[PDB]
Each structure stands twice: as structure tokens, then as C-alpha cells.
Amino acid sequence: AHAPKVIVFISGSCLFGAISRSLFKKLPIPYTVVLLILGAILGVVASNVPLVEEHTRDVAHMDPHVLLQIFLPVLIFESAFAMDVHTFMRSFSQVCILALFGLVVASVLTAVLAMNLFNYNWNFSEAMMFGAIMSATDPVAVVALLKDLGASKQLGTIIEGESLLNDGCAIVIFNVFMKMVFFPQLTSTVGQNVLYFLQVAVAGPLWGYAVAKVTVFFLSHIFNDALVEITITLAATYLTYYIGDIWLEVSGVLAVVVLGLIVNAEKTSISPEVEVFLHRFWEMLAYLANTLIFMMVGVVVTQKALVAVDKMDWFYLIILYLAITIIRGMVISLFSPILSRIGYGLTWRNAVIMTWGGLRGAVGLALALVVENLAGNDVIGSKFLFHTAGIVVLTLVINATTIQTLLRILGMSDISIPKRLAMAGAVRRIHEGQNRTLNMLKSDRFLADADWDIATAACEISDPYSPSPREFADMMEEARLRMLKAEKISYWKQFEHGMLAREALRLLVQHAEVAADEKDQFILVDDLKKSWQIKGIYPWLKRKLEDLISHHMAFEVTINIAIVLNIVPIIMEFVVQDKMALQKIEDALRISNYVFFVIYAIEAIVKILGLGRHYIVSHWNKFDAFILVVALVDIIIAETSSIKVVKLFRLLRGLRMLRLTKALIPKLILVVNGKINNQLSLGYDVGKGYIIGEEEVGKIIDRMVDNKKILRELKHISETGRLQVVKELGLLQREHPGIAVSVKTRQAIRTILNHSRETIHELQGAGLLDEMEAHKLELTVEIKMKRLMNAPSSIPPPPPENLLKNVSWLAGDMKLIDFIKARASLLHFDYGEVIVREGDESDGLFLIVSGLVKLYGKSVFEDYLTVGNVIGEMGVLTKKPRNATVTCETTVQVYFITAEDMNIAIDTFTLYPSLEYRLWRVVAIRIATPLIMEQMAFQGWTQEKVKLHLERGYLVDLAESHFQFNIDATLEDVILINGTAYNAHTREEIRSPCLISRTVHKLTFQYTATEEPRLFVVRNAEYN
């Protein structure tokens, strides 16, 4: 049988592909040409050696139904899967216009050329097949160069997407015309052609979308079963293609393209291991398909094609190559006016790169082989295959090689100075580390005899890339570029620790790089605003739907299931008895459906009774009664011509479905919630990342630039942008409560799980945890993380009493929570009201539970606070006039706790975690964060890292002595929160929130109660 033998041939193909790919890695030409040469050699051998001819012939000739039904789906799905879906979607308008219309025009022009130039005297359909074959490209070679050489990813994504779309459309057009050429059919009605177009073009993407959504849905509900995920993902593609193309007659390739794009986009629903495995697997399948196709082309072109090739054919091939290149260039130029004014916008040199990069690939050869096989013995098949192979060889020999030099000639090859400098710095750092380790290793007793001459040569890494106003302006530009670079660094740091998702980092870095190329330009809040600006369609849909949705626990699901049951007889009988108009089926159906209608009616009556006659007050109940009456009338008058019978079969058949829609509406609400959540999460991530980056860059810039004027101006710019962004973010919470709460909780759980994984890794590195149980714990962590993606899109906002239950200093003891609850008074305000003035006397605590408040006051401080923040916290502790004004921005609502009530609580709650201790720790962390930051800014720690580190610290009891001695061997950082302190030795006075210097071995204070000392310290991870 062929089953094992084809495996032998396929393995031989893999071996030849490996040889060609390896032995000529450093040569310019791609390995596919070598594969073609090997195939030609094998073909000529088989033509003269019957021994191997018998073996080869039985498998070399492949049926058209293995190429189209297997190879092409593999190639197309692999091409789609490896695509960066987000950038593709963001350029989709331009890429789709170009792909579709350019393909149509190019194929038409190529067909016209073929008809006019070639003496084959083909008809138009054959010429269209020819043009469709010649218009399919495969730039995988050029996209790699554009990816490696410089940050021109816009061009690479555009060209790859154009390749994908034109390949799909070329396959569709070829399928359409191949039928007219080789499987002629009777003249079709215009409506028939319209329906054919709808089936091929519209039904394909819809079928693919449906299957993709179902597949991702099921994937989201699989945990710790990587094998099942892989199997489902693989089976989905082939089932989609087969059902679409064979059974539904729908264009399979487009469905597969849509499935690939969707599955690639929804990467979060797939465990990362499965993601990488699938990527590699599909790449390998595409590689095998390419090698097989190329070798088959060589074999068959030598066997039976070149025998029917004349001198004029070579001239025709050369002319055709020139003509197709010129046609692609002309198409790009013709569409340039439109493309330039949408999406990225192609530059003059980008057009040349695209034109020259139009490499033809395996898809064209597969279609040519299909044509050749179908032709059988006509010259048309041989000529088609010869021309396609010639074009592919020419492109892979000329374009695929000269593209590298043309990149330089156009000036796109050079790597930018910033990347060169970064690479040089990294190389120098690596060399210094290598020198350190080399020096260290020579001390080992068990490595002293090492031949360092060899070691140095082996490990070394080489550089891969180897006061005047006119002066003040130069300084200003230099500082601007510096700050942009620092912002980029901060964004990357945030991402690497998981503070941000990949898309947010992409957007932020794109904006930062764009802002550099404009004079005196900085990242603008308005530019970022588009990220978190919710498209109005979905809010409009939610608002409209919520109106419509506005007797025990399951009396409605029962009727829903009843409709879900009886849809089947209604849909089936009235569209089956038309054919059948066996008997006992109708005998049962008649009375069974009649009694079904009766039971529904009686259940409606039961609920009318259990709820009273007011049941009919509801709007939808009126419709239910109406459909009940219609069914009653028709059935009863039947039980008492066709047109008085089809009033059931068509009309009532239609009406019975309608009342089911009242269950779909809630699900559509939940789906719109998911969409709005997906947008709002990205908006929040972008805004938060920008704010954090600005905060850090302010600290860094404080010391980076010496020029005081530039320092002041840049700090003003940064603060002005940050305040705008934070206010804009705050408004969103008011706009959509539930979705905001959902996103916030999601991110909180994500961060907690990330730190849990980090702790597990730390434990394993230390060895305290066994090398195996770590994987069990990490598995639990990973499944818990994946369960987040299924979290509800919206969560009802917690009531205020819960907000009091969760404040950091209250939460640890329900006796204190129930005490403070008994006295807290809820207050309300209007826009513009002032809660506290600067320098007024102390009244108590405010906990903000709704709305937004703006703070202003001398340290100069201007920022906004939102729900869950505590305000006035120092005024009950230090018994001092207020440090700032707080003004309401949007109908603020707050809990207030009076100074007397706090004094009583503090006097009455003095367990080990003293209430005063908790209150001072919450003040101390917020006051110390900036102090630690400004000292540690240059170093690696981020603000989140600084806060988490400080969290380990504690306040000193500071009652045994009014002098503190510091053990640097066990103490990491020392912060004086409040009080007056002085060094024991030098007696220098400290009377401010200050970071204690290292040299201070012993501190000293005074007994005066006018400023009670409060010292916060952080100890080493070890004891003491």
C-alpha cells in the first residue's frame, strides 16, 4: 500500500531539505532553489533508471485533491498564524485595499498580457488562471530582513499581510476559474452568480469566525491538559477547512485564514507552553510542505514539461518576469494616492521595497501542479508549469538576493545611532563581566590548571554591528531626547516585571519614539487619550439593551428549555412534510405538538395564578399571550385548503422562535460588557504606565540635567501631563463603575499571583522547597491565573460599609471594625465644595468613598485622589493645622470620623498591632516612598519594588531609650517619619521627614511631647 511508502518519500524530502538548508546557510541564494535543482536531478535520473522510476512515479504525481485539500490549508494557516495580529488589524484598511484591489487589477492585466503576447491563443478563463497563479507571493524571505534591519516593523507587517490576503484571494479566484476551464457547467443565472459570490466571499469569513470563537471558548475552559488544547487547536483547523470547502461549499481558505488570525489574537486563552508548541509545529509543517512542493515541481518539470519547451518560451518567460514586476510597481503607484492617506502611509522608498520584494512562493507552484495534473496531456499544463517555475526561480535568484543590496542603496540598511550605542554599551558590559569572572575562576583550587588561552578565545563576544540662546536650545533638545529615552527605559522596566501587558508597552513605546522626531515634542496626553476613549457604539448598545431587560427559582429556565426542545419539531416538520407530503411520524407529531402548546399555555396560567392577574402587566407577557392566542386559534379551528394550513406551518413556525430572544438579550449584555472591559483595561494600563513612567522620570531628570531652567521647564511639562492623565483616568471610573471594579480586581489578583510565583522561585533557588513540589505549586498558581480570564466582565460596586471593612489599618480586627462602624458618619458633597482649607485646625478623618477630589497646597502639591484613599490622616496624629486644601471635583461622597471618636478608639484599642501603630505605618510608607525613590532612582528598583520593600519594615517601639543605635550589618534603610532627631556624636539636628545617612551610627531624641518621635526601619531578610 502507499500508506508506508509515502512516509519514506516524505522522510527523504525532509533529509534533502535539511542538507540544502544547512550546507548553503552562508550563501546568498535561498535553499528552495537548491531543492528545485535536486528535484530536477532526481527527475532526470528517474527518466533513465527504471529501478528508481518505479518507486518514484507511484508517488511523485500527486492528485489535485491532496494539494488543494491538504498542502494549501497548511501553508495558508501557517502564514496567518505567525502574523502579528494587532499591528495587522491596525493597518487592516490599507493592507486589505491593497491586497484585494491590487490583486484584481494585477491578475486582469497579467491575463490580458498572456492572451495578447503568448502565441498559445488561450481564452480569457485560462489567462485568468495564469494571472491568479502569477499574482501569489511569499515574502517570508524579505520580512525577515526587514524585521532584523532597523525598526521598520510597519513595512514588514504591511507586506506580510498583503502577502497573506493576496494568497487567499488568488486561491479563491483560481478555484472559481478552474471550474469554468476544466469542469464546464451550464450557463448560470445572474442570481446564481450572486449567491456563488456570497458563499465564497462572505460565508467563508463568517464560518471561520464562528468556529474560531467556539474553539477559543472551549480552550478557555481547559486546565492542565496541554495535550487536549493542542489536539483541539489542530483538529479545529482541518475540520473548519473540510466542512467549509467540501460540505458547505464555502471558501475553506478564507475560513482558515480567519481562524488563524483569531486564534493568534486570543493568545491569552492558551497556555504559553501550548502557544510555543503550536507555533513551532505549524512552522515545521509549512517547511515540510515547501520542500515537498519544490521537489515535486523539479521532478515533474524535468520529466514531462521541458520536453515541450521551445526557444520562444524562454523569451516569453523573461518578458513575463519583467512584465509582472512592472505591473506590481504600477499597481502600487496607482494606489499610492489612497494608501498614503490612511494607516501608516507608504513612503517613496517603501513602495520600491514592496515592488522588488514580491517573491513568488510555494502557493503558485502548487496551483501550477494542479493545473498540470488536470490538463493531463494538453500543452497548457506543461506551459503553465514551465512559466510558473521559471518565474519562481528568477525571483528567488534575482530578487531574493539583490534585495539586500537594494536595501542599502535606498539607505534603509543602516542601523540608527541609538541602537549602535546601546549595543556597544552592552558589549562592553558583557566584556567587563567576563573579565571579572575570568579573574575569579583563576583562584579556584580545582580549576587553576585551566588553559585560559583557549577559554578567552572561546567565550569572547564581538560587537554584531561592528549661556548663549543658540547654546541653550542645543541643551534643551539634548535634554528632551534624554527624557524620552528615560521614559522608554521606564516602560520597558515596568513591562519586564509584569506591571503592563505587551500591547500597552507597544503603544507607549510607539508614542515615545514618535514624539522624538518632532521638535520640542513630548508624549502628549491628547495623543494617548485615544487609548482609553471608549467607542460609543458599545455604550450605546449597552444602554439600549438594559432598557429591555429592565414564580420560584427556575420557573423561567424550564420554559426556556421547553422552547429549546420544541424548536426541533417546528423547524423540521414544516420543512420536511413538504417533501413527504412515514405516516406514524405525523401521527405522533400532531397530537404531541398540540399537547405541547397546551402545556405551555397551562404553565402560563399557573404563573398567572401564583403571581395574580397582574401577570399580563409585563410587556413581553403580552406577546406571550398573543402567540398563545394565535396557536390556540389555529390548532382549535384545525381540530374543529393549504393557505389555511400554512398559517401554522410558516407564520406560527416563525412566531414560536421570537419569544426565545428574551434569553439572548442578557447574554448580549454580558458580551457588550466584555467588549467594553477589553477596551477599558487597555486604557487603564496605558494611563497607569504613562503616569508611573512620568513619576520616575521626574526623579531621574532632577539629577540628570544640570541646567536649572531646563530642569524647571521639563518638570513643569511632566507634572502638567501627569495631572491631566490622572484626572482623565479618574473620570472613567465614574463613567463605568462595574467594569472598572472588574478590571481593578483582575489586575490585583494578577499581581498577587505574580509575586506568589516569584516567592516560589526564590524558595526553590534557596532549596528550602523540593525541586518537584515547586512544579505542583506553580501548576496551582497557573490554573488560578488562567481562571481570571473567565472572570465576570463587570462586578457590582461594593457598598460603603465594605470599603470601611477593607481599609489597611482597620481590617485586622472585627471588634475595631464594629466600633468604628458604630460612629462613622456618611457625608455628601457637590461639585466645587471644599472639604478642608490649607492651615485650618484639625477635625478628624475623611475616607473618600465616591467621586474625585483635587488636593492643592504648600509642601507645590497638586494631585487628585479617588475612592479608598484616606484624607486628613496626619491631623488626628500630629494635632497640627492641615497641610493642604482638598476640593471636590465630582459629587464627592466620604465617611467622616470625628477627632474625639479617633482619640477614644486609639485610647481603647491597644493590642500588639496598636491602632496608633497601624495609622503611623500607613502615614510612614506614603511619606517615605519618595525619599527612598530619589536616593534609589538610578538603581534597578521600581516604585512598586520600593513600596513592597518598605512593606517589610516596621516602626521602632522607641520607648526603652531616646537614642537609637544602627546595626548596618542587619539594617537596610532607616527613615525618620516625624519628630526631631540629632546624631549622638556630631549633634547635627534633623527636624523633617528625612532619610537617615549611613554614617549615623547612633541617633538621639528628646522627651518633649510637642513632636513625638516615630522611626521606621527596614531590616535585612535574615534575623534581626
Ligand SMILES: Nc1ncnc2c1ncn2[C@@H]1O[C@@H]2COP(=O)(O)O[C@H]2[C@H]1O
Ligand atoms: N504629598 C502628598 N501626597 C498625598 N497626600 C498628601 C500630600 N500632602 C498632603 N496630603 C494629604 O492632604 C491632607 C491634608 O490634611 P492633613 O494635613 O491632616 O493630611 C494630609 C494628607 O492626607
